[PDB]
């Protein structure tokens, strides 16, 4: 089963396979993102690219409000025009590599909808805690 | 009840490791111009914070001879040095045939120099003029197999050509604080009895080290730090005759050196605008450059180093002997003084002995009675290997003095014979790693391992 | 008490002391892990090392699933062979500096067990939220 | 309303306005803090310094215990001497730019009080979970 | 030659005053005075923000 | 040496600035023919230049 425990799938071993299996073992794609040691100025620049791009990816995952932040649900509706495809088709049949080609046309809107919804939730939760 | 792994972050744990340390210096150096002195430009301003906090319950093993940080400092100094002499004038029109005149003044213990006249390319690059300048004898070599005793060459040009040190930078041993980078820390031994290797059972932590002196000195350690309570001896393995032995003092032995010769700085022009500085006339009487040490204090310090050598060699008296001999820069006490670089014949110091019982200097006949060392002086300096291996130190116009403190000795045990009761030690410490190794003896860098896992009675709520 | 409030223990003041006290004041060992300013290429290489190593330590602490991420419990049982030592002996008598020598032989297995258990918990929590 | 949704206020569009409105749209001041690409050693230092300063700001927000970490309440009481000003005056009338001039005299004490209180809460929560 | 050695400008580079946008690094911003009446010092009571000049 | 399929090189003698910067000596070294070009329009078949 995909719940290997002693997961060994390297950098990208979940690629190509069905999204139902790739939903597990996300950590190997996340854990590996930082590595390397120094040579000169050029590969020092290469080293900073990993750091800065990773922290950018964490900015996006942070202002969207994830808790246990490598999977989190959201309150923004899936406007069906974004996929117009069945849930079972997306998760069981398709793969993440192919799914990138579908949603990538529309990501920049979702990346702000999640932001504003999370900020709304933050203020509302502070208000509820004050009322409590 | 059952135990589950519980992870803690912010956890005090160490690994001794290699790291790239900062260079830090005091704030008073930063109002000056660029690289005057280098600490103003190539190092960060320091901060006294944090305090020298003490980790009372700790025990940690320290080392000096497997220590990486002294070698890292050596590399830092060498690389900075190449960076510092890069913009200065490259010379190379000085290797013209120097014609050096004889003199009717009687030779002897006066350190007479050679008045050498030579052709230079003036500011008109494709035109020349005759120019004269006085060079010390060690700077000068007879020309070639096409022998003429009146014609000479600089000691370079048998070697990669040499670069003058710009007068805009001065090579004072400015204190340098080395600091571990963020995420690392430096552990400082608090026990004064540390003997070079093994556990310091009482340690302190600091982010920045003492204001380490980057001092250039061969046979004696100049302006260095001091031990808190007792004279100390340090060596990787005293069994070996080849390994250097460091000695670190409780109180300093004052040393004063000087040029009584009153040089005048000549300003020769070499090609496009750049100037070459050289010694002009000796405006004054010719006199011997030398060094001084208070004789009774040196005797006391040497006999006390004798008692400390007896702790490792109990059944023997200690004899001190002349230096190793051979190369001038190795056998002599070479050190920096005000801009000039002295080379002293220390055979007059290391000539006494310890009888196994302290010989009293009290009551003192005269505390200002001095032992004198008569020192050569070089301008062309072959400081290090792989630094470009050359400096021309320009002469500075005055009868200078560099009254300073001795705080350590670099001896070396001579070859044994007959298991003799009097087996001897010679000054032979050549490498400048040992100078900083004698001063960085308290310190080690630790890599923080802040992520630890331990058991306790709790499992994640689900 | 170890609850000093105005904690002043510098970088490492808890080292050597009992782990019962060093369990408190973890923040000083964590807060101090970033500092320094410019000197050329070499110090810049030193500076990037601090940031990258800190982010690595945050990767490990994040994929393991901590909430309030400087202490968290886990659901992975302590296979006793990792210590074979009493809980009171570990926490009261002994110190963290010594505990490094015990567990360091076995850390690399725990660092993956926590990962797989956390990812399992993430998927199970999303499933439970879907069923709710 | 300030709940724009498609927020467009750039780097600092909430500056000057009342704190009641600036309490929302905090994300644009937070999202924009990483950007740029390389030119030489001099600006590579600028690129690294932005990442380091951000991570420092995250150290402070992390050891204080924020969940949903761009707004979080704390258990440290507001010693009134820090402002001696009405809540409605602070939030409705004043602005963040002006409020900096008030609290900045005293920030360094709060930055340690939150630290010690959060670490206290962490140990207490572990103890309660153990008792549960 | 009453001065340090001097160097020719290579014809492969031309010294046109090309426009240069100075930009603050990430985490900093540049505030731009919008009031045309600015006299070199003192408060601009109307300001704009730009990442690049 | 007789020409042919033997790849004979040219024995070139030239003045060098010795260790003494403003003194010179005649020195000889053999260079392959592709490294060597005849001098200039001030033509002399016995005088040559490096291909740089
Ligand atoms: C060049 O040589 C002259 C002497 O020919 C130096 O001047 C003399 O220096 C001595 C230093 O010992 C002065 O004596 C006194 O020294 C004590 C230290 O024990 C100090 O406390 C006194 O206040 C005083 O300075 C002496 O007065 C002075 N002048 C003469 C005429 O002897 C000169 O210092 C040398 N050049 C340089 C740059 O040092």
XYZ file of N, CA, C and O in Angstrom, chain A:
528
model
N 0.849 -1.226 0.000
C 0.000 0.000 0.000
C 0.868 1.253 0.000
O 2.064 1.189 0.285
N 0.256 2.397 -0.320
C 1.002 3.648 -0.354
C 1.441 4.084 1.039
O 2.371 4.888 1.165
N 0.800 3.577 2.092
C 1.259 3.825 3.444
C 2.484 2.993 3.766
O 2.431 2.081 4.596
N 3.599 3.307 3.101
C 4.794 2.475 3.192
C 5.395 2.539 4.590
O 5.924 1.540 5.092
N 5.330 3.702 5.235
C 5.970 3.897 6.522
C 7.421 4.296 6.359
O 7.787 5.449 6.604
N 8.257 3.346 5.939
C 9.642 3.632 5.568
C 9.691 4.122 4.118
O 10.220 3.468 3.220
N 9.104 5.303 3.907
C 8.932 5.827 2.557
C 10.294 6.101 1.939
O 11.195 6.648 2.587
N 10.447 5.713 0.668
C 11.731 5.722 -0.021
C 11.631 6.301 -1.427
O 12.508 6.032 -2.256
N 10.603 7.098 -1.715
C 10.284 7.453 -3.092
C 11.120 8.621 -3.612
O 10.790 9.199 -4.653
N 12.202 8.962 -2.917
C 13.148 9.923 -3.454
C 12.537 11.293 -3.629
O 11.698 11.737 -2.836
N 12.966 11.983 -4.687
C 12.455 13.320 -4.958
C 11.013 13.305 -5.447
O 10.191 14.091 -4.963
N 10.685 12.421 -6.398
C 9.473 12.586 -7.191
C 8.751 11.274 -7.489
O 7.947 11.231 -8.430
N 8.966 10.221 -6.699
C 8.448 8.901 -7.030
C 6.937 8.816 -7.152
O 6.439 7.858 -7.753
N 6.201 9.782 -6.603
C 4.750 9.801 -6.734
C 4.273 10.374 -8.063
O 3.083 10.250 -8.375
N 5.155 10.997 -8.845
C 4.741 11.604 -10.103
C 4.238 10.544 -11.074
O 4.747 9.421 -11.124
N 3.219 10.909 -11.847
C 2.648 10.014 -12.834
C 1.550 9.126 -12.284
O 0.530 8.914 -12.947
N 1.741 8.605 -11.075
C 0.758 7.717 -10.478
C -0.521 8.482 -10.143
O -0.579 9.713 -10.205
N -1.557 7.726 -9.786
C -2.862 8.315 -9.514
C -2.795 9.256 -8.316
O -2.021 9.043 -7.378
N -3.615 10.312 -8.358
C -3.606 11.304 -7.287
C -4.044 10.703 -5.958
O -3.678 11.220 -4.897
N -4.828 9.624 -5.990
C -5.228 8.978 -4.750
C -4.043 8.457 -3.958
O -4.047 8.486 -2.725
N -3.013 7.977 -4.657
C -1.802 7.506 -3.992
C -0.860 8.662 -3.686
O -0.243 8.706 -2.615
N -0.737 9.613 -4.615
C 0.135 10.762 -4.410
C -0.360 11.692 -3.311
O 0.417 12.528 -2.838
N -1.628 11.580 -2.903
C -2.105 12.342 -1.756
C -1.321 11.979 -0.507
O -1.035 12.848 0.325
N -0.974 10.707 -0.359
C -0.011 10.275 0.636
C 1.388 10.482 0.071
O 1.574 10.688 -1.130
N 2.381 10.426 0.951
C 3.781 10.644 0.601
C 4.033 12.015 -0.013
O 4.889 12.143 -0.896
N 3.301 13.045 0.414
C 3.643 14.407 0.015
C 4.936 14.872 0.668
O 5.584 15.801 0.174
N 5.325 14.243 1.780
C 6.427 14.764 2.581
C 7.762 14.653 1.856
O 8.638 15.503 2.049
N 7.945 13.621 1.030
C 9.217 13.468 0.325
C 9.406 14.584 -0.697
O 10.522 15.079 -0.890
N 8.329 14.996 -1.373
C 8.406 16.169 -2.237
C 8.634 17.454 -1.450
O 9.148 18.425 -2.016
N 8.265 17.483 -0.166
C 8.412 18.687 0.646
C 9.723 18.684 1.426
O 10.363 19.729 1.587
N 10.134 17.514 1.920
C 11.313 17.431 2.777
C 12.587 17.764 2.008
O 13.498 18.404 2.546
N 12.665 17.340 0.748
C 13.897 17.393 -0.031
C 14.257 18.787 -0.532
O 15.339 18.955 -1.106
N 13.393 19.783 -0.336
C 13.510 21.039 -1.067
C 14.741 21.862 -0.696
O 15.050 22.813 -1.420
N 15.440 21.534 0.393
C 16.634 22.258 0.822
C 17.792 21.284 0.977
O 17.665 20.271 1.672
N 18.921 21.597 0.341
C 20.125 20.774 0.413
C 21.255 21.513 -0.293
O 21.042 22.548 -0.931
N 22.463 20.968 -0.165
C 23.625 21.431 -0.895
C 24.616 22.176 -0.013
O 24.305 22.624 1.094
N 25.842 22.304 -0.526
C 26.900 23.070 0.122
C 27.628 23.900 -0.931
O 27.325 23.827 -2.123
N 28.611 24.677 -0.473
C 29.040 25.881 -1.180
C 30.120 25.577 -2.212
O 31.017 24.756 -1.988
N 30.020 26.256 -3.358
C 31.147 26.531 -4.242
C 30.955 27.912 -4.848
O 29.908 28.182 -5.443
N 31.965 28.771 -4.715
C 31.997 30.035 -5.436
C 30.764 30.915 -5.252
O 29.983 30.779 -4.312
N 30.612 31.834 -6.209
C 29.495 32.775 -6.178
C 28.283 32.190 -6.897
O 27.138 32.391 -6.473
N 28.509 31.472 -8.001
C 27.396 31.016 -8.830
C 26.534 29.992 -8.102
O 25.305 30.132 -8.043
N 27.149 28.958 -7.538
C 26.376 27.977 -6.795
C 25.934 28.500 -5.435
O 24.993 27.951 -4.854
N 26.574 29.555 -4.919
C 26.012 30.252 -3.767
C 24.708 30.942 -4.143
O 23.753 30.955 -3.357
N 24.653 31.531 -5.341
C 23.387 32.058 -5.839
C 22.370 30.940 -6.000
O 21.191 31.113 -5.676
N 22.815 29.783 -6.499
C 21.923 28.635 -6.620
C 21.370 28.221 -5.261
O 20.199 27.841 -5.145
N 22.205 28.285 -4.222
C 21.767 27.914 -2.881
C 20.668 28.843 -2.381
O 19.717 28.398 -1.728
N 20.784 30.140 -2.674
C 19.797 31.102 -2.192
C 18.476 30.955 -2.941
O 17.416 31.301 -2.406
N 18.506 30.452 -4.179
C 17.263 30.229 -4.914
C 16.371 29.228 -4.194
O 15.157 29.432 -4.082
N 16.958 28.137 -3.699
C 16.177 27.147 -2.967
C 15.545 27.766 -1.731
O 14.344 27.607 -1.485
N 16.337 28.520 -0.966
C 15.849 29.122 0.271
C 14.704 30.086 -0.018
O 13.620 29.990 0.575
N 14.914 31.008 -0.960
C 13.921 32.048 -1.198
C 12.658 31.471 -1.828
O 11.543 31.836 -1.436
N 12.805 30.573 -2.808
C 11.623 29.991 -3.434
C 10.842 29.123 -2.457
O 9.602 29.154 -2.459
N 11.535 28.346 -1.619
C 10.837 27.610 -0.579
C 10.064 28.547 0.335
O 8.907 28.279 0.680
N 10.697 29.633 0.779
C 9.999 30.517 1.706
C 8.817 31.190 1.033
O 7.807 31.445 1.679
N 8.909 31.451 -0.271
C 7.754 31.954 -1.013
C 6.608 30.942 -0.986
O 5.443 31.297 -0.733
N 6.925 29.674 -1.265
C 5.911 28.630 -1.216
C 5.313 28.494 0.173
O 4.142 28.122 0.299
N 6.094 28.784 1.216
C 5.543 28.808 2.564
C 4.718 30.061 2.821
O 3.775 30.007 3.609
N 5.051 31.194 2.194
C 4.190 32.366 2.339
C 2.800 32.049 1.844
O 1.801 32.306 2.531
N 2.727 31.476 0.646
C 1.425 31.166 0.069
C 0.672 30.182 0.952
O -0.502 30.384 1.258
N 1.349 29.141 1.430
C 0.664 28.169 2.271
C 0.346 28.710 3.663
O -0.481 28.119 4.365
N 0.972 29.811 4.076
C 0.717 30.389 5.380
C -0.435 31.371 5.400
O -1.296 31.297 6.281
N -0.468 32.304 4.444
C -1.544 33.294 4.458
C -2.882 32.676 4.049
O -3.936 33.262 4.319
N -2.868 31.511 3.395
C -4.081 30.747 3.107
C -4.666 30.057 4.336
O -5.819 29.616 4.274
N -3.913 29.933 5.428
C -4.481 29.495 6.688
C -4.404 28.015 6.986
O -5.180 27.533 7.818
N -3.510 27.273 6.339
C -3.409 25.844 6.607
C -2.934 25.589 8.033
O -2.016 26.254 8.522
N -3.567 24.622 8.695
C -3.090 24.053 9.949
C -2.753 22.587 9.713
O -3.528 21.859 9.083
N -1.601 22.153 10.219
C -1.020 20.917 9.733
C -0.688 21.127 8.273
O -1.232 20.459 7.388
N 0.217 22.072 8.018
C 0.255 22.784 6.739
C 1.105 22.034 5.712
O 2.203 22.443 5.332
N 0.568 20.898 5.271
C 0.872 20.399 3.935
C -0.396 19.908 3.234
O -0.396 19.715 2.015
N -1.477 19.703 3.990
C -2.826 19.568 3.451
C -3.743 20.399 4.338
O -3.672 20.298 5.568
N -4.598 21.218 3.727
C -5.628 21.914 4.486
C -6.818 22.169 3.574
O -6.652 22.478 2.392
N -8.016 22.044 4.137
C -9.225 22.415 3.416
C -9.466 23.919 3.528
O -8.856 24.615 4.344
N -10.365 24.418 2.681
C -10.699 25.835 2.630
C -12.205 25.984 2.459
O -12.910 25.033 2.113
N -12.691 27.200 2.708
C -14.109 27.524 2.607
C -14.485 28.176 1.281
O -15.642 28.573 1.113
N -13.550 28.302 0.343
C -13.819 28.925 -0.952
C -14.477 27.893 -1.869
O -13.912 26.805 -2.056
N -15.655 28.156 -2.445
C -16.273 27.151 -3.317
C -15.447 26.891 -4.567
O -14.830 27.793 -5.139
N -15.447 25.632 -4.990
C -14.881 25.258 -6.286
C -15.857 25.677 -7.376
O -16.786 24.939 -7.711
N -15.659 26.878 -7.926
C -16.430 27.305 -9.087
C -16.177 26.302 -10.203
O -15.055 26.208 -10.709
N -17.217 25.549 -10.585
C -17.030 24.346 -11.392
C -16.369 24.633 -12.733
O -15.747 23.731 -13.306
N -16.436 25.877 -13.216
C -15.733 26.256 -14.437
C -14.231 26.024 -14.334
O -13.562 25.911 -15.367
N -13.683 25.956 -13.119
C -12.264 25.688 -12.953
C -11.859 24.303 -13.450
O -10.757 24.177 -13.996
N -12.699 23.273 -13.275
C -12.410 21.954 -13.841
C -13.538 21.397 -14.705
O -13.273 20.878 -15.794
N -14.794 21.530 -14.261
C -15.927 20.841 -14.900
C -15.627 19.352 -15.109
O -15.875 18.790 -16.180
N -15.078 18.700 -14.085
C -14.751 17.281 -14.137
C -15.122 16.610 -12.823
O -15.146 17.244 -11.764
N -15.414 15.314 -12.906
C -15.907 14.574 -11.753
C -14.817 14.421 -10.699
O -13.626 14.348 -11.016
N -15.238 14.376 -9.432
C -14.294 14.218 -8.329
C -13.548 12.892 -8.435
O -12.319 12.840 -8.294
N -14.285 11.806 -8.685
C -13.659 10.494 -8.810
C -12.700 10.447 -9.990
O -11.629 9.841 -9.890
N -13.062 11.080 -11.106
C -12.158 11.145 -12.248
C -10.868 11.866 -11.877
O -9.772 11.441 -12.259
N -10.983 12.967 -11.132
C -9.801 13.744 -10.771
C -8.894 12.936 -9.851
O -7.676 12.874 -10.053
N -9.473 12.289 -8.836
C -8.641 11.703 -7.787
C -8.159 10.299 -8.135
O -6.992 9.971 -7.893
N -9.023 9.456 -8.700
C -8.664 8.065 -8.950
C -7.947 7.882 -10.284
O -6.921 7.199 -10.349
N -8.470 8.484 -11.352
C -7.946 8.254 -12.695
C -6.764 9.159 -13.024
O -5.744 8.689 -13.538
N -6.879 10.451 -12.731
C -5.883 11.411 -13.178
C -4.649 11.355 -12.277
O -4.606 10.631 -11.277
N -3.623 12.118 -12.661
C -2.396 12.262 -11.889
C -2.060 13.742 -11.760
O -2.525 14.569 -12.550
N -1.254 14.067 -10.744
C -0.927 15.462 -10.452
C -0.242 16.135 -11.635
O -0.521 17.301 -11.951
N 0.667 15.409 -12.293
C 1.379 15.940 -13.450
C 0.416 16.406 -14.535
O 0.634 17.457 -15.149
N -0.647 15.642 -14.783
C -1.647 16.043 -15.764
C -2.560 17.128 -15.206
O -2.980 18.031 -15.937
N -2.878 17.054 -13.909
C -3.798 18.020 -13.318
C -3.217 19.426 -13.324
O -3.972 20.406 -13.333
N -1.886 19.548 -13.315
C -1.272 20.871 -13.413
C -1.729 21.603 -14.670
O -1.966 22.816 -14.640
N -1.862 20.882 -15.782
C -2.252 21.512 -17.036
C -3.671 22.065 -16.991
O -3.985 22.991 -17.746
N -4.530 21.527 -16.124
C -5.908 21.990 -16.025
C -6.012 23.271 -15.208
O -6.484 24.298 -15.708
N -5.572 23.220 -13.949
C -5.814 24.325 -13.024
C -4.852 25.493 -13.221
O -5.176 26.615 -12.814
N -3.693 25.275 -13.856
C -2.679 26.324 -13.954
C -3.174 27.567 -14.684
O -2.606 28.647 -14.496
N -4.215 27.442 -15.509
C -4.780 28.604 -16.182
C -5.430 29.589 -15.215
O -5.574 30.766 -15.561
N -5.815 29.136 -14.014
C -6.677 29.899 -13.117
C -6.111 30.075 -11.712
O -6.834 30.568 -10.839
N -4.852 29.704 -11.465
C -4.342 29.653 -10.097
C -4.291 31.031 -9.446
O -4.544 31.166 -8.243
N -3.957 32.063 -10.224
C -3.709 33.386 -9.659
C -4.945 33.977 -8.990
O -4.806 34.844 -8.121
N -6.144 33.530 -9.365
C -7.360 34.029 -8.726
C -7.584 33.307 -7.401
O -7.920 33.926 -6.382
N -7.393 31.986 -7.402
C -7.567 31.195 -6.186
C -6.562 31.631 -5.129
O -6.862 31.646 -3.927
N -5.352 31.997 -5.561
C -4.301 32.374 -4.623
C -4.619 33.663 -3.872
O -3.959 33.947 -2.866
N -5.600 34.444 -4.332
C -6.066 35.619 -3.619
C -7.374 35.365 -2.895
O -7.627 35.939 -1.827
N -8.224 34.512 -3.477
C -9.463 34.144 -2.796
C -9.175 33.451 -1.469
O -9.809 33.750 -0.448
N -8.210 32.529 -1.461
C -7.843 31.873 -0.210
C -7.295 32.880 0.794
O -7.606 32.809 1.988
N -6.487 33.830 0.318
C -5.910 34.852 1.187
C -6.996 35.669 1.880
O -6.998 35.811 3.113
N -7.935 36.213 1.100
C -8.964 37.063 1.694
C -9.889 36.257 2.600
O -10.301 36.743 3.663
N -10.217 35.017 2.215
C -11.058 34.193 3.077
C -10.364 33.891 4.402
O -11.002 33.918 5.462
N -9.062 33.600 4.366
C -8.337 33.318 5.600
C -8.279 34.549 6.496
O -8.401 34.441 7.720
N -8.072 35.729 5.908
C -8.059 36.941 6.726
C -9.426 37.190 7.358
O -9.523 37.589 8.532
N -10.495 36.960 6.588
C -11.847 37.078 7.125
C -12.047 36.129 8.299
O -12.586 36.515 9.344
N -11.605 34.877 8.143
C -11.709 33.908 9.230
C -10.904 34.344 10.445
O -11.350 34.149 11.577
N -9.718 34.914 10.235
C -8.893 35.334 11.364
C -9.592 36.421 12.172
O -9.684 36.338 13.407
N -10.112 37.443 11.488
C -10.806 38.513 12.200
C -12.068 37.990 12.879
O -12.376 38.362 14.020
N -12.811 37.113 12.196
C -14.038 36.581 12.781
C -13.741 35.723 14.004
O -14.485 35.757 14.990
N -12.661 34.942 13.959
C -12.285 34.136 15.113
C -11.842 35.005 16.280
O -12.162 34.692 17.431
N -11.110 36.093 16.012
C -10.767 37.005 17.102
C -12.029 37.605 17.711
O -12.139 37.724 18.938
N -12.996 37.980 16.871
C -14.244 38.538 17.381
C -14.997 37.518 18.229
O -15.521 37.849 19.299
N -15.061 36.268 17.766
C -15.758 35.232 18.522
C -15.066 34.958 19.852
O -15.730 34.767 20.877
N -13.732 34.929 19.854
C -13.001 34.745 21.102
C -13.236 35.908 22.055
O -13.325 35.703 23.271
N -13.338 37.129 21.527
C -13.674 38.275 22.364
C -15.074 38.146 22.952
O -15.285 38.449 24.133
N -16.040 37.699 22.147
C -17.401 37.532 22.648
C -17.494 36.401 23.665
O -18.301 36.476 24.600
N -16.693 35.353 23.502
C -16.699 34.232 24.436
C -16.239 34.682 25.819
O -15.066 34.994 26.023
